[model samples]
Target: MTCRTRFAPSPTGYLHIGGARTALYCWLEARHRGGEFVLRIEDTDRERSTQGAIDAILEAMEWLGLDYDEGPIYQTDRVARYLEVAEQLVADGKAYYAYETREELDAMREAAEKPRYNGAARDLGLPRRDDPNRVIRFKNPLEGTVVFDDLIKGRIEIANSELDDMVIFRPDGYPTYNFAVVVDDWDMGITEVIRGDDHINNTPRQINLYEGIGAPVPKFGHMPMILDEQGAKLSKRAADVMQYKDAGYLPDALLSYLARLGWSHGDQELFSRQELIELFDVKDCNSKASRLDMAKLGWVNQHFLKTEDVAAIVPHLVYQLQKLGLDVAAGPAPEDVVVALRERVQTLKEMAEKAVVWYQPLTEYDEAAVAKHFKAGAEVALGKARELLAALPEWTAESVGVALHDAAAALEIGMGKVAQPLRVAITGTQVSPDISHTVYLAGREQALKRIDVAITKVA
Candidate 1:
C-alpha cells in the first residue's frame, strides 16, 4: 500500500526531542516512499492546551524543516466525530456506562490494591441499565490478547486481562484521548501511526477500540525516548537551551542528527532527508532507548558547519555574533574565516567569542604566557622578529613560517620561544592556529604593529 503517516502532537507544553524525532521519521518516510505526510494537532485537552504552546510546536517543526503534506488538522474542531465513535461503541453493546466520581473510583482502586475496575458496573459477568452519571467504557474481552504489529517494535502483545474497560467518553460529555485519536487516524486515512514508545501501554487500548469500532487499523511505529548526557530524559524544565541555539545547528544539521538518535543506516550518522527516507524503514529503527550524547551532537553540528557552504553558514553566524555584541569588519579576514573557525570550535557563540578578539586590537598579553615565554633579551628577540616579518616577501604560511623559523635559528632560540610570544603579543594568548596563517589573517601590518607594542612592554 502507498505510505501515509501523520505526526500528531498534543497541545501539551513544549515539543521535546522525542516528538521532533518521530515527526522527522514520519515525514521523511512518506517523502522517501513517495507517499503522503500529515500534521495533526491533537488539541483535545481543553484546559491544559494553550495557543502559545501550539504555536511553539509549529515554529519548532518549521525550524527543523519537517514539512507536512497536509494538515495541521485540529482535533478540537472534530469533537462531534469522536462523539460519533463513542455513540457507536455504546450502541453496539461493545461498551457500557459507569457513574463513579473521581474520589469514589480512586477509593475503589486503592482498596483493590492492584488498580482494577471490579465494581458491578464494570463486571463483565453482570449486565446493568445505565445510570445518570454514565460514561462510556469499551467492553474488552478479558481472555484474549491483542497483537500490535509495530513497525519498529516487532509484534507487541498485550493481554486483555491487563487492559480494563477504559473509558471512551468521560462523564463531562467529552471523548477521551484513546477514543479521539483512533477515530481521527482511521477517518483521516492515516496509513501509519508514528509516535514515541512512552505511549506503548496505550497502544492495545486504542487498538482494541479500533477493532471494536471496525475502524481500519493503521500501522504503528514507536521511537524510543531521548535522554540527556546524564541518561535522564531531556526535560523542558531543565533544558540547556542556550547551548543548542548557540551551537551552529543548521536546521538540516538538527534534522540529520535527530534522525540518527534512535535510527540509523548502516553505521552512517549523517544523511539528508532524501537519504534517510530511501534507506530507513520501521524495522531499522532501534527499539532500545538511547541517551542524547551532547558531545556527539556537537560533533555532528561542527561537521555541518565545516562541510556546508560558507555562504549558507555565515548569516546564522552573523546573527548570533550580533546577539553577543560582536562586530565583523570588511577585510581579507574573508567572511570565510568565520566558517573556517567553525571547523575548530563547537558552537557559533564560541566561534564568535574567539572571532571577537581577532577583530579587535589586543591591549594585554596573557601574563602567564609572558611569564613562561619571555626571557632576558626577549624584547630584543621580539623587536628583531617584528622587523623580520615586516620585510618578508608575500606573507603566506610557508613564507612567514620560513622567515620566523629562520629568525628563531639566527637568534639562537626555539621556534616556540619566538612563536609563543608573538601569539600572546598579537592575540593575547599562546594557544592558536598555525602561526603563519594567524599572522596572515591578522593582516601583516596589524601583526607587526601589535608585536611593536609587546616588544616595548618586555623592554
Candidate 2:
C-alpha cells in the first residue's frame, strides 16, 4: 500500500525544535513513498489556542520547506463530524453516555485499587439524554492486551485491565484527543502514524478507539524524545530551545542536523534535501532519545554557509546587513562580501558583521591593535605604500597583493609591517580577510584615505 503520513501539530505555541523534527520525518516519509502528507492542526483546546500560534506553526513549516499535500484540517472546525462519530459509536454499542458527576467520579477514583475509571457505564444501558453535562466513554474490551510493533521502539503492549474506558466526548460535547485522533486518522486514510514517543501511552487507547469504530489502524512509529543538554525535554519556553528562523539557521542545514539527531545512513553526517528524501525510512529511526547539540548545529550550518553558492546565500546576508543598519545598495556587491567571508563565518550574521567594515568608514582604530601593529615605523611604511598604490594603474586583489609585496621588499621589512598597518588603517581591526582582497574591496580611494588617516594618527 502507498504510504501516507500526517504532521498533526497542536496550535499551543510557536513550532519548536521537536515539532519541526517530527514534521521533517513525516515529510521525508511521505515524499519517499511518493504518497500524501497532510497538515492537521489540533486546536481543540480553545482556551489555550490562539491565531498567532497557528500562524507561527504554518510560517515555520513553510520556512523549513515542509510542504503538505493535504489541507491543514483544524479540529475545532470538524466539531460536527466528531459528534456524529461519537453518536455512531453509541448506536453501535461500542460506547455509552455517563451521568456521573465530577464528585462521584472523584469518589470512585479514590475508592478504586488502581485509580482507573472502572467502566461504571460500560453496560448500564442508561437512557440517552439531551443533557449537555453528560459524558460519552468508549466501551474498551475487558480482557485483552493491545499490542503494536512500533517502527522505532519494538513491541509495545498495554493490557486492557490497565486501560480506562476513555472519555470520547466531554460534558461540553467536544471530542477528546484519543477519540478525535482515531476518527481523523481513519477518515483521512492515513497509512502510517508517526509522532513523538511521548504519545506512546496514547497509542493503545487510540488503537482501541480505532477497533471500537471498526476502522483500520494505521502503522504506528513513535520517534524518541529530543532533549536539551540538561536532559530535560526540549521546550519552546526554554532559553536553549530555538526556532530555526530566529536562530539564523539555513533551512537545509537545520534539516541536515535534525535528520541525524536519532537517524543515520551509514556514517553519513550530511545530506541534501533530495538525498534525505531518497534515504530516509521510518523504520530506521533510533529508539533512544537524542540531545540537541548547539555546537553540532553550528558546525552543520557552517558547512552550508561555506559551501553554498554565494548568490544563494546573499539574500540571507542582505537580511543580516539590513538588520545591522548597513545599506546593501551602498556597499560593495553583497556577493563579494559573502565570498570573502564565507570561509570564515558560521552564520550569515557573523559574515555581515565582518563584511560591514568595508561599507562603513572607520570611526577609530582598535586601540590595542593600533598599539600592537601601528608602531613608529608603521606610519612611514604606510606612506610609501599609499604612494605605490596611487601610482598603480589597476586595483584588484592580485594587483594589491603584488603592490604590498613590492613595497615590503623595497622597505626591507616583512609583509606584516605593511599588511598589519594597512589592516588597522582600512578596517580598524587586526583581524580581517586576506589584506589585499580586503583593500581591493574597500576601494582605492577609501584605502588610500584610511592609510593617510592612520599616518596622521601615528604622527
Candidate 3:
C-alpha cells in the first residue's frame, strides 16, 4: 500500500510556527515512506473562514517548502461529495434528517441533566431532507466501544454511549467537520492522519464516521502542541509563518529548525534535509510539548546561513536587501555580500543590515570609527587614497588592494592608517570585510564619491 499523509488546515488564520511544525512532520512522514503528501483546506465553516486565511496557509506551506503531491482539495468544493455521503447514509438508515431548533433541542437535554442532542428524532424516523429546519445526524452505534492504536499517543478507547448522535449535515447545507473530514480523507486515500494533539478527542468520533461512511479508518497520530511562554497553545494568529519569510529565514533553515522543536536524533543539533528525511521517525517525537526558543532558532538559522551553499542563500538575501529599499542592482552581487557577511550574522536580515552600506549612499561616518581613525592627518591621507583609487587602471578587488597599499607606502604611514580611514570613508562604518574588498564592492564610482565626501567631513 502506498503510504499517504495530509496537512489539512482550516482557513481561519495565518499558519503559525506550530502549524508549520505539523506540516513539516506530515511532509517528512510521507517523504520518509517514499509515498505522497496531500494538502487539504478544510474550509467548510464559511462563517469563520476567509480567502485571506486560505491564501496565508497556502503560501506558508510553500515558503516552508512543504510540497504536496495532490490537491489543496477544498472542503468547499466538495460540499456535494459530503451531501452525497450524507444522503447515502440516510438512504441506508444509518443517519436521518431531524427537524429541530436550538431552544427545543436544549429543552429536551436540559430535562435529562446533560446539555446534548437528545436524539429525540432518532426513532421518530423523520423523512424530510435538507429542509431549513432539518439537520442530518449520524446514527452512532449505542453498543460496544471504538478503539484504535494512535501512532503517536498509543491505544485509546471510547465507549459508544459517551457520544451523542452528532449532526453530520447542517441547515446551512454544510457538512460538519467530523463528517466532511471522514469523506475527504477516505476518498483522497489518506492512509495516516497526523495532526495537533487537541484533535485527539475527535479521533474516536471521526473513526465512527469513517465506519458509518463504510470506509477504511486510517491510522492516526497527534503531535503535542508547541506551547507559548505562558504555557498556552499558540493561536494560529500568534506568529504568522510568512513573518519568518519576510524576516529573512532561509526556507529549509526554518524547516530544519521546526523539525527539532519536539523531534530529535541523538545529540544531533543540525540536519540537512537529506539527513532529516533519512533519520526522521514519528515515534521519536517528544510526547510532551515543546516551547519556542528564539535563541535556539537563531543558532539553527545561522548554521544554515553559514554552511549552506552561498548561491542557494543569495535569493533570500536579495529579498532582505530589497526590503531595506536597497536596489540589488546598484551594488555588489548578493552572493558576494553573503559570502563576506553570512559567517558574521544569524538571520539574512542581519546580513542585509550589515551589507546596506555597500548599496546605499554613505550619509554619515560611524562617529567612533571617525574619531579613532580620522585624526589630524586622516583627511590628507583620505585625499591621497581617493586619488589612487580614482586613477587605478583595473578597478577590481585585486587592484583596489594594490592601490590602497600603494597610497599607504607613498604616504609613509602604516597601512592601517590609510586602510582604516578608507574603510570609514567608503562604508561609513567601523567594521567591514578587508578594507580593499569593501571598497571593491562599493565599486569605483561610489567608493570615490564617498571618499570625496569623507575628506570634507574630516577637514
Best by TM-score: 2
- CA lDDT for candidate 1: 0.76
Q: Which ten residues in a row have the lowest lDDT in candidate 2?
A: 237-246
Query: What does the lDDT read for residue 180 in candidate 2?
Result: 88
lDDT of 3 by residue, 373-441 (tens): 777778877988898889998888789888888888998888888888888888777788788888888
User: What's the lDDT of the predicted structure labeled candidate 2?
Assistant: 0.85
Please name the candidate that would achieve the greatest lDDT relative to the true structure. Answer: 2
TM-score of 3: 0.91
Better of 2 and 3 by TM-score: 2
lDDT of 2 by residue, 1-459 (tens): 778999998876678778889999999999999999999999988866788888888988887889999988999999999999999889989899898877778787675267778687889978788876699999988888999998889899998888899899998768998998989999899999999998999899998888878888888999888888888887754322234555567888889999999798999998888999999999999888989888998999999888887787888788778888986776678887877778888887778878888888889678898888777878778988898888889877778888888899989999888888898888888998988888877888888888888898783
Better of 1 and 3 by TM-score: 3
TM-score between candidate 1 and the true structure: 0.80
Superposed model 3: Cα runs more than 4 Å off: 108-115, 129-131, 236-238, 379-415, 452-459
Worst 10 residues of 1 by lDDT: 237-246
Q: Could you tell me which residue pairs clash in candidate 1?
A: none
Residue lDDT tens for model 1, 1-459: 788889888867667667788888888878878899989998877766798888878877876777888988998889888777777776677887777777777776564345766534754433334555677788877788989789888999988777788888876667888888888888878888888888888999888888888878888888888877788777865243223555656666777888888887887888766677788776688888888776777787788877877877787677666776645663334364563476788767677666665666777678787776565577766876787888887876667777788789889888877777787777777877666666666777778888887776773
Clashes of each: 0, 0, 0
Error of 3 at 419 (Å): 3.9
